[PDB]
Every structure is written in structure tokens, then in C-alpha cells.
Amino acid sequence: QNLKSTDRAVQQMLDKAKREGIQTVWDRYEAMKPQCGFGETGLCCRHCLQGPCRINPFGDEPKVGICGATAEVIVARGLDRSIAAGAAGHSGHAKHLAHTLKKAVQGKAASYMIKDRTKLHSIAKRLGIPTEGQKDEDIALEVAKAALADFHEKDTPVLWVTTVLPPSRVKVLSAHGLIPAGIDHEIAEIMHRTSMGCDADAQNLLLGGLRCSLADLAGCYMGTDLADILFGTPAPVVTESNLGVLKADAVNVAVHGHNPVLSDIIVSVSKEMENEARAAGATGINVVGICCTGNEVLMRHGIPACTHSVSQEMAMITGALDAMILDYQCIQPSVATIAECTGTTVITTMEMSKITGATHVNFAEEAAVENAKQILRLAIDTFKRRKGKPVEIPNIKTKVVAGFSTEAIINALSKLNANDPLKPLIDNVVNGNIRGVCLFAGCNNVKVPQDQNFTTIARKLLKQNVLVVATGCGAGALMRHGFMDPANVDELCGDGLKAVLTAIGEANGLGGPLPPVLHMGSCVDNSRAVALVAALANRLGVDLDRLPVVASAAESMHEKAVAIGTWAVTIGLPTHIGVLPPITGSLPVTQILTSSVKDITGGYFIVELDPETAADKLLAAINERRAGLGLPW
Amino acid sequence: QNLKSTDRAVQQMLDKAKREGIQTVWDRYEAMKPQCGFGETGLCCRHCLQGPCRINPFGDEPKVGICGATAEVIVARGLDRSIAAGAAGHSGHAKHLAHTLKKAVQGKAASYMIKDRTKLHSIAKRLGIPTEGQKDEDIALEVAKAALADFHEKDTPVLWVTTVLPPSRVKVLSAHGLIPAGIDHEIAEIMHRTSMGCDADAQNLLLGGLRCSLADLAGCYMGTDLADILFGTPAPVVTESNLGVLKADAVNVAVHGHNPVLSDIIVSVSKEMENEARAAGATGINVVGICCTGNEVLMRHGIPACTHSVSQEMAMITGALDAMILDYQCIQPSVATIAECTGTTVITTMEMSKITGATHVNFAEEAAVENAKQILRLAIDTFKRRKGKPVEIPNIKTKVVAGFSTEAIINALSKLNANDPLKPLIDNVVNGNIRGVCLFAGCNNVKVPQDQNFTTIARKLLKQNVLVVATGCGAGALMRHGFMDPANVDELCGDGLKAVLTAIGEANGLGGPLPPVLHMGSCVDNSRAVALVAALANRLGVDLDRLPVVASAAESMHEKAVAIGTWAVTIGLPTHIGVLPPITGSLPVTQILTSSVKDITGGYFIVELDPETAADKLLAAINERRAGLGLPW
């Protein structure tokens, strides 16, 4: 089970699933081998009914699509659609939050409100929305209207791109025509241009893809902005992670998905429901997190993270998961089937994300508390049905210090320099105590022993004094292996990095360092890392492609992660991907994405499936940036 | 060559391409056999990097996707993305026209103007835009703004759906939540909900698809509306079709693609350029049409149609095609490669549709006449390079009577009943002279001997007195085989249909009948058939799913045709498709699309690959509707 997951709690549940005959994601993967090499390489096209077309990577015919589409066209078109799908997910999430804020300040959903008034005003100012003499509800209405306006063409480009990157970076992108005109506009233009008999030039196709990835970035940043306004900006929190956060004697309720519009409500209402749970024989309601919705309520409320990504079925295999409350994205639909064996009540809540066999609750912001109570009462009913039964919760968990929003990081740094908070960070980059910054983002992927790439790469970078930040299930992987426990700083961090983490932590009164890795939140909260990197670029007076900052999607799977990797490249970062993307079927496409895009945006992809090698390549990229700034390395 | 195309001119060019060693679409098809059965059946998923996943249609594992996605989920998700891509193409076309109208009436592009003032006012009235006391330029500005507004969420649903279907049909659709909220909004929601770990219920997925297909219908209808305003509503015209419309001694210029924003300009400017062409040694400039842009200028100007769809390479094989001017959609990118052998200058004009090796001209409405002159001068240069050379233009063409916009059809009927023009049509439906109406739409497809399904089905329906209307390359197939020549009415039409066609034609002064098939225009002009069917429904006081009206996508290929077929089903029509769509891998999906959707919208798909059988099934569907209205059959 060690070849499936490096997580010991997951291994224990895989043994339980095996002896109970419950098929897992790893079993379904084994049943799929060998996988199709045309698809793996990207040399397959089904964009019209003359297809499917395939191209042999090497050898004899077929060498070209039926319509004449070349390998480079087919590969670039498929990649573009993946970027568009990723953009559609992040921006649907943001769109939902924009409508929630609008309803809240028009008096249509009293369960929602402006919780972070300071963030509201800063966003409005960044957007050019006047605040002086205005009511908060009017400013927020204007912010929500501006958010919804960025989805379509208008007098301005997408402001959640042009107002969040430095002017020098926006100029570079505008010169190549890469600034999105509208978020859903770009998604649709990708689907048009990649349909049959349309765009058939790999360079033109990929430039369209870069622009669509900036539409995804805008969705991410808008999602983070709006959730912070509605639910509060994260500040440092201490909690726990892994399956041992389930409690046999409590009603265990997992929030799972990405959009916390309901799950933030679930957290608040579950406290109100405690006595009702106690009357049922439980100690209380134990809300735990799965995937990015779990990250959202971990960041803001300290809700412990149960598990992530590829191993999400294992939470149910314990026998103690009374309910799993789903919104959308990255939910394995197997959970609906597994629930018949484990007793878990799986509940969908969003109209456009239903799973055959799961109970659906039609959540509406107008009825959010009432929906939450209906959902939690199903969970309490489920706990009663297992009162007495034996469960197997692995007694395995880690300590997690998290909640490092960019505002929180700036505040923490401000204890070392009040009026120039970025300077202590840059000082230590310059003097070598901090070699560079690496963002770990993205998913787990069944092809990769779970967490192996994230932890192998992270260990090597931390020893070389790289400041490591993490989001999504990359944060999940590192959190479950102790990388967010400050007690592991001595073991994990090089001397220079340790000195910096200790100095900042002691100055924030902690008596100990910051954790080895800074948890910056959910997948949309990759936008927080952009905010930090852009602030560093502005403070240094350089563009992002001169900073010693890299990204690693070390184990990625979702189309959303393809979009994020592409916009990391587009804003200027060396961007590692640790699984094979479907580009190896076209050498020209691969050369554009890993080499010649350097000449356009300054960023580039680093495809490397071996984690030790990937870490060396990421260190080389960081050290090249150091050399270009004239620094020692 | 008879197994490749039933078009004798295409057969002659296939012989020329064969002996000259020029690879064709049919050769590339042969090189692709056998095609992938997982893709053919829809049982393949590449929506995340854990893939590709496939499911054996029958037998042992794999039986399920790695994430747990079932065959029915995988099939429905792939279908939904095809609908979204189709919607993105038709609505990008419409969006382009909306921006062109806006620029024109704001004084930004003097080559464009309000040509059909009557259509402008009727559209405005249908939209609720006040016209009394308003300048035309202000009304048109309001119309263009309303068009662009339908792409995003707003206070109203998509008006190019809700204002173009009868209230009873809109009520049926609203009751099932099928009315689109915004065109690009729906496209993005499809891409989100079909991404990994999102919607996983086949019924929910397909209902989303029906709603997205209505977004495609809105794009089609908006495209037709705006092009009519800008370029004029079609009225009956006489021209010719097939390769024999090329002229060895003229500069032959093909307009190819879908959006006639530039090609309508090409038509006007080419007349201005005649003396320049003559000075080069040509008789003049011979503009001819390929695919739907050719249909647009055929409908409005009588430009002869050179060829269509699968056989588009053959126009170049003549040796006489000096230029091929491309916008986007359904252009085989092989043309850029074939051009190196044939001498043709292939020119792209749209930023998001480029082809490696083709010359690009950056068309802009602001510079439209100047761009047109640059393009035509490349064509004249190309004619000079072949002055003297031998060409092989098959001396094969047909007579084509076309231009039957819905306004033209109503006008023609008004000569038999001035104040109630639909009544003579309904009278003859009721008394049996017209058994029903069949719309032929969609593409050719290399899997089907070119035009075989369109003509086989059309012959059987016409003998049974069905009124046949046609668009796109279905109109192209029928036009090239003589179905738009009134001289073939006696041979092709049953006695009742002949009587009606003769009566209408004689009353319009023709001295002979209307043609056997009524050409209603381009693929977006499928919206014209909706306008006619909706007017018939309103006049009869029934919903569309009670009319004896059917549709046949007899040889379809493009994602656009998948979207059109789906919205034909969604507005209530029995809808035949004559190629295998990737749904046969899921019996539940197939049952929804061919049977249970009857209970939702009243329409349904008829999948039938054998054309004789398809015609019987379409006749049965028409006759069932007749019986439901109490009519003899």
C-alpha cells in the first residue's frame, strides 16, 4: 500500500477497503492499465464526428488528422480546452461568490454579510471604485458588479488581471495581446478556435491559451477577494490534519468541494446544533475538511483537515463519516457508490453538480441556515444508525499551523520592520538566508504514489533555504506529513531558512519559528501567492520574471491545475509539472512551452517526473534568477 | 471515386489529385482506419491527467473511470462539451456581427451600414426596444447592445431565445429550467460542470446540454438577424453551383468560412477591381463560394457556389483557384499544404483562426475596403503566375434558385393570400398536398459517400409530398445535385407537392414552380427555419411539438451540428442524425436522447445510418404528428 500512498493513515484504510472488498481509486487505476498512449501524448482528437483521429507518435500512418490537423495543432487544441475548462471552474466559483455578495448587500440573504470591511475598501480602491462618503453596502454592491462585469467584454479589459499585476508585467502581456477581454468571453473563444476547421497554428493557439489562463487567474483572484470580504481574511491558526481528526463518538461531517459559500455556514450552524447532536448520543458535531472547501474553513476557522484529493474515499472507509457535504470540483463520484457500504450520507448541494445515488439538498443563499440545519439533521440521523458499531479511525494526525494569507504574512513581517514589511524578506533573499521562494500547488494524481513528489521536492528545497509556500492539495500533502508543524523546523530547514523562520516567529510572540511551509490556502488562493510575488516585484522595482520565485504542480490532475500552471508561466515564473501533460506528442508544442515562451513572458514549464531531478531543476531555476539579480548563489 | 463522393465533379478532381499525388481528406481517412472504438462510442475521457480513461463497451475491465465516472457520465460529459463548442462557434460569429453593427452606427467603420431598415425595426420591436421617434442609428445601437448583453447574466434571460419561440414553448422550457441565462455563461458552465469531480448524473448533465443548445440557437438567430440588418435580408435569386462555376480566364476567388463580414465586402470591392483584373490579362474577378460564407453571399448576391464541406480541397485541384479567403469554421487546414502544389493563395483574415503556411491579412472593419483590395491584389498576382498554364475545371454545374429567407417565403405565400400568408401553406398541410416539412441541415462527413444520405432521403420525402427546406452544406449537397432547379420538379416531387410549388411559383409570376427544395441559407440561418416553424405554430395555436415538422442532420460532422441537432430536439422536433454520434457506449444516455426526452421537450433524436431507413423513420414521425392533429396521412 506504500506504492499507492505515502500516508500511513491512507495505507491503513487501503487494507480495510481491501479486506472488505471496496474498490478504490487505486483499484480502478490498475483496471485501466495499460492506458492509451495516443491520449497520454495528446495525439488524439475527437472534435468532430469524422473522428476519432489519432497520430502515431512515431512510425507510419496515421500521421495527420482527417481534416489535415497536424500533431502540433491537435496537441495545442487539446491543451487549450483544458485551460478553458480550468478557467470555467475557478471563475464559476468566483461568479457564485459575486452573486452571493450582491444578494447579501441588497438584503436578500441575511446569513451573508460584509465580514472583512478593510478588505472590501482595499479592493474597491484597487479597482478605482470611490469609497469616501459611501456606505459599505454600496461599495460592496459596486465591487460585486465589477466582478460580474469582468466575465464579458466591456470598455475595460479584465480588471482582476490588469489591477493585480505590476504595470510592467501588464505592458509585457498587452504587447503580446494576452490580456483577457472577459472571463467567459475567453473561455468561449477557446472553444470556438479549437473546434474543427478554425485555428490551426500552434503558436497562435498557445498564445490564445496563455490569455485564457489569465482569465483563470482573474477567477482565482476574484474568488479569493470575494470570499475574504464575505467570510474574513485568514490569519494564523493552529489545527490538525489526517484521518485521526475524526472522532468515533461525535457526528463526523466532512465539507468537500471548493466553494465555501455553504460550508462556512455549515461551520457556524453546527455549533448551534450541538445540543441536538448531544441528545442523539453524540458528543457534538465534528466538522472536518476534505479538499479545498476544507482548506477554506481550515484557513478561516481552524477546522481540522481530514484528507485530500486522491485519498478522499478513505475518510468514508473508517466507518465514522456520517455525512459528506459536496459542492463541486474534485469530488470522486465513486463516493456515492462507496456510501452504500460505509453508511455515509453523501449530500450534493449545487444544481449543476449532482451524483447519481447521492441525496440532493437544493441549497440557496436565501435559505442557507435552514438548508444547513436540514443537512446536519441528516448527519445526526446517520450517526444514530451507527451508534454502537465499530469504526476504524487510524490514530494518525499532524499538527498544522496555517492561515498565512498575504495580509497575514505582511503583518508577520511587519513585526521586524513596521514601515517596510517586505524588506526583512528581501534582505534575507539578498544575503542568502532565503535562497528563493517555491509555491507548491495542485492535486494528487493516482499515477504518483500519494504525496511522494511534494515531500521529496519540499525536503530538498527546504534544506537549501528555499521559503516554501503551498496551496490546495499541495498544502494538504505537506500538512499531512508534518511540514506545517513548527516542531519540525530543526529537522527540515537549512540554517539560513531556520534563522528567518525563527526570527519572524519570535517577533510575533510565538517563542518558536513559523512552520517549515506557509499554508496560503485553497486553489483559488494561489492568487494570494501572486499578490505576494507582485508586491515583492513592486518593492524591488523589477518584473516577476526577474524574481527567484518558482512554482511546482508536483502531482497535478485537474484541468484547473493545467490552467494555474499556464498562468504561472504567463506571469513570469519557472513552473514545474511533475506528471506527464499531454504535450509530448508534439515536439514544437513542447519546445514552445518549455523554451521559447521564455522570450514572450519570461516564464516556462519544467516537465520532470522524477522528484529528485525536479528539485535540482527548480533549484537551478531559482539560482539563475539569483545570478540575474547579481546575487550570490 | 464513386464510393467517396456522389458528385461527378468531385470524382473527376479525385482522379486528378490521385495521379498528381496530392493527398486528400479521403486518403487521410483511409490512413486512419480502423478508428478507435472507445472514441467512436463515446467511452473515452481525458478530462484530467489521471486519464486517459476508457470503458470497454462490453466485456471485462475497464468498466469505470479512474475517478468513478460511469459510462453514462463520461458519454454525457463529452456530448455536453461538443454542444458547448458548437455554441461557442455560432455565438462568436454572432458576437463579431454585433460588434460590427455597433462600430458601423457609431461612425467607426463606414464600409458597413444599416442596409435592411425594415428588419432593424422588426427586431427592435420583437426585443421591446422603442422605435417611435428614434433615429435608426440609435435603434441599431440599442439592438447591438442587446445582442452583446445576451452573452452574460443580466436582469432578463437570453432574449434571442425567449422572444423568438412561442410563449407556450418558452413556458415548457422554463418549467424544466432550460432557458439560458447568458450565451457565454452557459458555455462556461458546461465546461465547469463536465470537468473532473463535478456533475456526475446523466440526466442532470443532459438537461444542462439542452440549455446550452438553446444558447447556440440564440447565437444562430442573432447571427442571422444582425447579418440581415447589415447586408440585407435574402430574396429569391438564381445562380449556379459546382466546380464548373470556376472560369479559367478569370481571377477565381473563393470566399470560405462562415462569417461574411469581410466576404460581403469582397463581393462589392471585386466589382470595383474589375479593370485592374482586366489589365492583368483576366476577364474579371470571379468570386465563388465555399461552405457557409459562400451560402451567405449566394443568398444575398447570387454568388455561385463552387463546392462544400468534405470536397473543399477539390476546388484547388482544378489549378484555377487563384485565392481562397478564409474567416473561420469548417476549413480543412490541409488547404494550406495543398496550396503549395496548386498555386492557390490561401489567406486567413481572423486573429483567432490562422493556418501555418497560409498568408495572413489582419482584417479590420475599420479598413475593410482597403483589406479587401490588398487581398484581391494577391489574387490577381496569382492569376498572372498561371497565365498560360492548363487547368482542369470539370464542366459540371447545376442551376440554383435560392434566397428563401422566411420573409421571402411569407412574401411568396402572400401572393396566394395577402392578409393571411401562412394559411395557403397550412391549408395544403391539412388537405394532404403537403405531408409535412423537413429541414436538412449540417455538413458532409468523410464516413458517408458525399451527399448520398441527403439526396437519398430527400428523394423519398419529396415523392411523399414533404416540403423540403435546407441550410448549410445540406443545401450545398442538394443544390449540387439539381434539387434547387425548378426544371426537376416533375421528376422529383409528388403530385400534391408539385401542385403547391407550381401554384406559388405561378402566382409570383414565374411561369413555373418554386424549386424542389427551398434554400434557407447558411448554418446560422437554421434560425430562419425556426422563425417559420414558430410562425406556423403561432398561427395554428399549438406548440412546435405538435407540428408535422422534422429535421435531418443526414451527414453531420461539426460540433456546431451537434448543437443544432440538440436544440432542434429541445424546441420540439423529431431530429434525425445520419452519422454515429458518440453516445452508443451508454444505453441510458441513448434512451434519454431518443426516447425519454419526448416527455421533456416533445422532440427526440432518430439515429439512423441507413438513408432509406432514415426516410421511412422521418415519414413515420411526420405522420405521427399528422395523426395527433387529427389529419389523414
Ligand code: SF4
Ligand atoms: S477536427 Fe480534424 S483531427 Fe479532429 S476529429 Fe475532426 S477530422 Fe479528426
Ligand code: SF4
Ligand atoms: S475525469 Fe475521471 S474518467 Fe476522466 S480522465 Fe479523469 S479520472 Fe478518468
Ligand code: FES
Ligand atoms: S485513441 Fe485513446 S485517447 Fe483517443
Ligand code: FES
Ligand atoms: S482511447 Fe481512443 S478516443 Fe480515447
